Amino acid sequence: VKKFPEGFLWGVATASYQIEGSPLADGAGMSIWHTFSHTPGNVKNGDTGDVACDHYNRWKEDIEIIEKLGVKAYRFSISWPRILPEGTGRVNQKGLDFYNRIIDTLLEKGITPFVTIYHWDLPFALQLKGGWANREIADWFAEYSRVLFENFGDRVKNWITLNEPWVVAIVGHLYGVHAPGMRDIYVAFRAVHNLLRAHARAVKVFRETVKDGKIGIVFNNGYFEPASEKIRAVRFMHQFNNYPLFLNPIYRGDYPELVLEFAREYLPENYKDDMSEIQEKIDFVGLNYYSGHLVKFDPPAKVSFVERDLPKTAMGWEIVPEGIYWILKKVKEEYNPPEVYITENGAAFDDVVSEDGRVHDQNRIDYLKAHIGQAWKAIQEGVPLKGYFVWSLLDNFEWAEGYSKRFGIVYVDYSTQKRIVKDSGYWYSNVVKNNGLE
Ligand SMILES: CCCCCCCCNC(=S)N1[C@@H]2OC[C@H]1[C@@H](O)[C@H](O)[C@H]2O
Ligand SMILES: [Ca+2]
Predict the structure, then answer these.
(1) Cβ(164) to ligand 1 under 6 A?
(2) For 1-438, CATH number?
(3) Which ligand 1 atom minimizes the distance to the CA of 178?
(4) Is residue 288 within a helix (H) or strand (E), and if so which, with residue range?
(5) CB within 8 A of 305, min separation 6: which ones?
(6) Angle between helices 55-69 and 423-434 (to 10 degrees)
(7) Domain ranges of the chain
(8) Which of 398, 407, 409, 412 is the pocket-test mutation for ligand 1 (most atoms within 8 Å of CB)?
(9) What is the DSSP string of 180-247?
(10) Fewer CB near the last or first residue (10 Å), C or N of the chain?
(11) Nearest ligand, CA of residue 121?
């Protein structure tokens, strides 16, 4: 048996644009994912978030699912342009009303809300003004965050400023694969820096507004292993792609060494002037983790991936459970944050509904079990892991892959919007009830 600490938080996670649909309902402004997905060529099969899981209408049902599974926490994100349709200035009460009902329902049902303030759906109005490239977003983001805190801080006590700011910056502004779909390395590194400044301003405002809650920030992480003896390229990928790109500034007041070696020229000339403010104290670190990568030096960023003959998900991501134990050990050893959460872990598989009406995703069960086992290990060795969140409650719009990738522990038939709890969801409910494995 692998039992977790008393009060360990077992949750599931979603993001607004991925599940809600109705992007322009009730006075909402367009987001950059609306405009990006409505641009031909950007998303597989021309898929958009227009309907998604119709959570905008089916939210009560979905929460009743969380309740019925006995899941203890729900991580969800708020659509900035539902709240402030122009990004700043006007506040939309119908947008606040939508999330107020969700929050009150969760609380009524004894489920702990964890709110992600930003999971990628920037108001389009702000993108016209340069979005994450513009220093002024530290102010726009603080004003947005202040509204959320003033309206919801009486009830929501667990907050996340940013989801995966590496993805936002690099995949959105260097690779151009995500909104706003740009390819400029100087813009990408100014977005990294402004994400940090905006994150810190929001925490500063939080201390002024919600004297009783906690706030943190969520990073994507891979487990990079070297293709031989010879490991520095592993060092670069860790410092660039993982929590250190952001935590080195927050805890130590500068970017990591190998990031500055690669990217100094792309950062603002006087970027250190902002570092003292970037060090605003945070309460926890959220780590997302899915995949391991075999890496070797290669004379683009002087790194290339080397395919491995390992079990993979429908994303083509290699399944390396020890990765989640490594990243938890590593974060304690490098920055020693006071709390850590695993804010996303999960897998995409080609799920099918059997003739028996059930989804027999033993592949997803095996994936979740192994990773929860490794998380358990990290705890035994002193990592202050307070919770673990499955990505995702529901199959949903998987960004540039559209609906072709299913991460839910609940199956969604998009022709009907029927939800079918998968075997993995049933399995997870039992883990939560037992507070651990076997
Ligand atoms: C190239 C395809 C672009 C979008 C397809 C997926 C690639 C990026 N996916 C990433 S980085 N994801 C993280 O966890 C699962 C998946 C996404 O569903 C979630 O919002 C993120 O927090
Ligand atoms: Ca549309």
Answers:
(1) yes
(2) 3.20.20.80
(3) 3
(4) strand 284-297
(5) 293, 294, 295
(6) 50
(7) 1-438
(8) 398
(9) T----HHHHHHHHHHHHHHHHHHHHHHHHH-TT-EEEEEEEEEEEEESS---HHHHHHHHHHSTHHHH
(10) N
(11) 1
CA distance 328 to 323: 9
- The SS3 assignment for 3 reads strand
DSSP 411: E
Quick one: which atom of ligand 1 is closest to the CA of 44?
A: 2
Q: How far apart are CA 120 and CA 127, in angstroms?
A: 12
Q: Which amino acid is at 76?
A: F
Binding site membership of 220 for ligand 1 (Cβ less than 6 Å): yes
Q: Which helix (H) or strand (E) holds 149?
A: helix 137-152
| C-alpha dihedral sign at 193, 198, 201, 207 | negative
Which residue in 168, 157, 224 sits closest to 193, CA to CA? 168
Experimental technique for the deposited model? X-ray
Task: Please write down the HEC assignment for all residues of 64-117.
Answer: HHHHHHCCCEEEEECCHHHHCCCCCCCCCHHHHHHHHHHHHHHHHCCCEEEEEE
Q: Is the dihedral of CA 141, 165, 387, 411 positive or negative?
A: positive
Instruction: Please work out, in degrees rounded to the nearest 5, the angle formed at the alpha carbon of residue 187 by the alpha carbons of 182 and 192.
Output: 110
Contact status, residue 62 vs residue 54, Cβ threshold 8 Å: no
Dihedral angle over CA of 136, 142, 148, 151, nearest 10: -110
Residues known to be catalytic = 164, 344
Regarding the beta carbon of 398 and ligand 1, being less than 6 Å apart is answered yes
According to DSSP, residue 175 is labeled S
